């Protein structure tokens, strides 16, 4: 039996969205205290397309099924020149995550297939578990939906190696999620940018590792133009600095 204190709403974080002329939600979860915090409980439970944050469960499935042998396997560029320059090269799992190389993961989903992708997302309890649409694009313009609170629930299982895949797969994905590390904290996260279906939003989901605690975070915000993509991390870090989680 699970016991859960409700999400505590801290509307003071809205000032961080307001200062940057933005609208969105930040959700934090204190792992030690088992307490959750958000600036907008309604938007915290609102489900959106995961977009590139789906690279986290997609990596886990591709690794557990042998589609990706390890983080060193090179996926050669198919020769198609695309709009984002860093996509037009060879990649491994580490660089495909860092630069958010969609075509690499579309090939992953095709090899996984509809049957295994559906069964794996159900085992993950991931969002609405709906892969309706193209097998290689559902997370970009299909039926899958996930909320910021559901993202944190999925990430907590990943951190504790509790997802129903091999521990090795989860360790490799958590290594590929490495974003920032210094003497004060470690950040393992994944960005996201949904544009094929309104509303256009940006994601940032992950956790902050401290010496004594882990703070899980999941944010999304309105993103009418790609000019404010950096606000996904800037606003999240402003909330973390206000809560004295990072210096
Ligand atoms: C994943 O989120 C992915 N985003 C996209 O492919 C885009 N739309 O998907 C619905 C996209 C890229 S540019 C545009 N106008 N729409 C990669 N995500 C990120 C990210 O930082 O989140 C990127 C910037 C590279 S594209
Ligand atoms: Cl993707
Ligand atoms: Cl690491």
What can you tell me about this protein's structure?
This protein has 247 residues and is α+β, with helices and mostly antiparallel strands. It has a single domain, classed as DD-peptidase/beta-lactamase superfamily (Beta-lactamase, 3-Layer(aba) Sandwich). The chain is built from 9 helices and 9 strands. The chain has helices spanning 14-19, 41-44, 55-64, 93-98, 102-124, 138-141, 148-159, 167-176, 231-242, and strands at residues 8-9, 24-30, 35-38, 47-48, 146-147, 178-181, 186-194, 201-209, 214-222. A 7-stranded mixed β-sheet has the order 1-3-2-9-8-7-6, with helices on both faces. Strands 4-5 form a two-stranded antiparallel sheet. β6 and β7 form a beta hairpin. α3 (55-64) packs across α5 (102-124) and α3 (55-64) packs antiparallel against α8 (167-176). The longest helix has 23 residues, at 102-124. It is globular and about 50 Å long. CEFOTAXIME, C3' cleaved, open, bound form binds at residues 51-52, 84, 100, 102, 140, 191-196, 226, 229. The active site is at residue 52. Its EC number is 3.5.2.6. The modification N6-acetyllysine is found at residue 55. The modification N6-carboxylysine is found at residue 55.
């Amino acid at each position: 039996n699970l016991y859960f204190q409700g999400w505590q709403e801290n509307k003071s974080w809205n000032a961080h969205f307001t200062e940057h002329k933005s609208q969105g939600v930040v959700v934090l979860w204190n792992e030690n205290k088992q307490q959750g915090f958000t600036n907008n409980l309604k938007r915290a439970n609102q489900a959106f397309l995961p977009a590139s944050t789906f690279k986290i469960p997609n990596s886990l499935i591709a690794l557990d099924l042998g589609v990706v042998k390890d983080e060193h396997q090179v996926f050669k560029w198919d020769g198609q020149t695309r709009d984002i320059a860093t996509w037009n090269r060879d990649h491994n799992l580490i660089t495909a995550m860092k630069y958010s190389v969609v075509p690499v993961y579309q090939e992953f989903a095709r090899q996984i297939g509809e049957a295994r992708m559906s069964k794996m997302l159900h085992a993950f309890d991931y969002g609405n578990e709906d892969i309706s649409g193209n097998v290689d694009s559902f997370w970009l313009d299909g039926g899958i939906r996930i909320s910021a609170t559901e993202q944190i629930s999925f990430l907590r299982k990943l951190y504790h190696n509790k997802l129903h895949v091999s521990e090795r797969s989860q360790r490799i994905v958590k290594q590929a999620m490495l974003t920032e590390a210094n003497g004060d904290y470690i950040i393992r996260a994944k960005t996201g940018y949904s544009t094929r279906i309104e509303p256009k939003i940006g994601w940032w989901v992950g956790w902050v590792e401290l010496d004594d605690n882990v703070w899980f975070f999941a944010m999304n915000m309105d993103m009418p133009t790609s000019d404010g993509l950096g606000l996904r991390q800037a606003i999240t870090k402003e909330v973390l600095k206000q809560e004295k989680i990072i210096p």
